[PDB]
Amino acid sequence: GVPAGDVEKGKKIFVQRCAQCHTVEAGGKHKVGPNLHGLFGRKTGQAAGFAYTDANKAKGITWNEDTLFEYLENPKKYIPGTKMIFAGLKKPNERGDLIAYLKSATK
Numbered sequence: 001g002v003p004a005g006d007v008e009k010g011k012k013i014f015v016q017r018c019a020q021c022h023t024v025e026a027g028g029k030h031k032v033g034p035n036l037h038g039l040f041g042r043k044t045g046q047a048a049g050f051a052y053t054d055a056n057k058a059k060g061i062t063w064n065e066d067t068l069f070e071y072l073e074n075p076k077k078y079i080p081g082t083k084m085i086f087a088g089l090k091k092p093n094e095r096g097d098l099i100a101y102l103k104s105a106t107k
């Protein structure tokens with residue numbers, strides 16, 4: 001149960017808040033964070049070639065709309081010890097728009 005998202009608004013959030021550390025396209029490079037291609041339906045810790053924390057790997061969830069919605073509000077609360085430094089997107093609408101963009105761009 002996430003709010004319906006606007007892909008265009010979500011693309012702007014992604015570029016301004018996430019692209020510093022993440023790519024989305026197939027074959028895109030790892031940066032500080034993992035490439036996100038195939039994210040939806042991917043369990044944590046699965047991007048080929050990225051060195052994840054044990055904390056991320058142990059969370060034992062599948063990335064999809066609902067889990068991203070909670071994670072992105074406050075990453076460290078959801079995965080204590082994660083190496084991702086990002087305070088969170090507090091507004092539910094910003095998370096919804098971003099998630100819709102990610103769903104389209106990581107296919």
Ligand code: HEC
Nearest residue numbers: 017018021032033044045046052053056082083084085086
């Ligand atoms: C660099 C300062 C980051 C910013 C800004 C964002 N992310 Fe990130 N992310 C980063 C790291 C180093 C990692 C790995 C964490 C670990 O503990 O190993 C991550 C991880 C994610 C994940 C999980 C991916 C997976 O399990 O394969 C997601 C879904 C994620 N990051 C999303 C994401 C988004 C959408 C961001 C903007 C709101 C964002 N992150 C910013 C580093 C950084």
